[PDB]
Design a protein around this ligand. Structure first.
Ligand SMILES: C=CCCOc1ncc(C(=C)O)cc1-c1nc2c(CC)[n+](C3CN(CC)C3)[nH]c2c(=O)[nH]1
Ligand SMILES: [Mg+2]
Ligand SMILES: [Zn+2]
Length: 323
């Protein structure tokens, strides 16, 4: 406790004051308490609190439980990454004007999913867990191993006493919401993004994309989750540089684990000894994974252009270092 009393008693600053509507938002100068306040404001301004009768104390407790469940010493996949993913979701819904295209339940599910999508992340990839015979990999048949675990943790917190922010939903709304949350969290497995994005891009290319279609709406929500998950790649250069260092720290740590536990030379992405490959790998990552997604998102909502624009600027920055 303690931290809970401080959070629950604090006056929640406006979204304007907190700057959470800005796509260029930076969490670096914020304390943990400030990120928690930002999170309460996200729920509030997305019309989720009174809408679903959330008690202030319960929401505060839930937010703190989510924050605690991240491993602070994991370099990139920690609370700050989850918080930034949620902030990008808020900005996309607000400044990006996606909010009015979705239902209240979809919004509720997306914010919860964004905040919970990496819960208890071990700092190693699905491939690593599979190669080291993780019990997690066995239980989930090597499919989206981490993501199934993140969802498991998400449910655990949602059901923990004093943290039930969904206790006010009707039976049918609860059922609908949990299904969207699971799909949203699983969507953050880049393997599923690569597997399903082809369909999304094709629908748009052939002018067949229709949000009114249940299946396409679900496909869009998955893509939106990926767009928010990768959002650091759209941030102003100083921010992208700093976060890229965190990503490298985490990947190189896994590389160390691979040399010791698997007796193998890690791929460049996880090889500290070849860190000189970072600029070129970043450009390739932006081209193959990022640009098409932000281009597609902007097509759906022009107001999301800032994400694409920021991504393009970072490609230029990384390319200048690579050439
Ligand atoms: C060594 C690390 C260098 C820094 O790396 C980064 N820094 C920041 C971000 C971000 C979202 O801002 C992202 C990265 C970053 N992430 C990468 C990932 C995981 C999604 N992959 C795998 C391999 N590919 C197969 C298709 C998917 N390659 C990446 C890369 O080159 N860069
Ligand atoms: Mg993840
Ligand atoms: Zn993530």
């Amino acid at each position: 406790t303690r931290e809970l009393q401080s959070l629950a008693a604090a006056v929640v600053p406006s979204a304007q004051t907190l700057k959470i509507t800005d796509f260029s938002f930076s969490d670096f100068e914020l304390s943990d308490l400030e990120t928690a306040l930002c999170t309460i404001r996200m729920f509030t301004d997305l019309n989720l609190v009174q809408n679903f009768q959330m008690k202030h104390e319960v929401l505060c407790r839930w937010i703190l439980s989510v924050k605690k469940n991240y491993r602070k010493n994991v370099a990139y996949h920690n609370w700050r990454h989850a918080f930034n993913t949620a902030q990008c979701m808020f900005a996309a819904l607000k400044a990006g004007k996606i909010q009015n295209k979705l239902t209240d339940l979809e919004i509720l599910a997306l914010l919860i999913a964004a905040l919970s999508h990496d819960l208890d992340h071990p700092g190693v990839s699905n491939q690593f867990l599979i190669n080291t015979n993780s019990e997690l990999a066995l239980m989930y048949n090597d499919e989206s191993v981490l993501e199934h675990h993140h969802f498991d943790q998400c449910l655990m917190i949602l059901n923990s006493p004093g943290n039930q922010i969904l206790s006010g939903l009707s039976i049918e709304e609860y059922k609908t919401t949990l299904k969207i949350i699971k799909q949203a969290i699983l969507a953050t497995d880049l393997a599923l993004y690569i597997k399903r994005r082809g369909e999304f891009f094709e629908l748009i290319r052939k002018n067949q994309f229709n949000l009114e279609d249940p299946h396409e709406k679900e496909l869009f929500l998955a893509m939106l989750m990926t767009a928010c998950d990768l959002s650091a790649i759209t941030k102003p250069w100083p921010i992208q540089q700093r976060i890229a260092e965190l990503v490298a720290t985490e990947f190189f740590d896994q590389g160390d684990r691979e040399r010791k536990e698997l007796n193998i030379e890690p791929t460049d992405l996880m090889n500290r000894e070849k860190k000189n490959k970072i600029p070129s790998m970043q450009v390739g990552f932006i081209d193959a994974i990022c640009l098409q997604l932000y281009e597609a998102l902007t097509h759906v909502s022009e107001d999301c252009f800032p994400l694409l624009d920021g991504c393009r600027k970072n490609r230029q920055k990384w390319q200048a270092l690579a050439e």
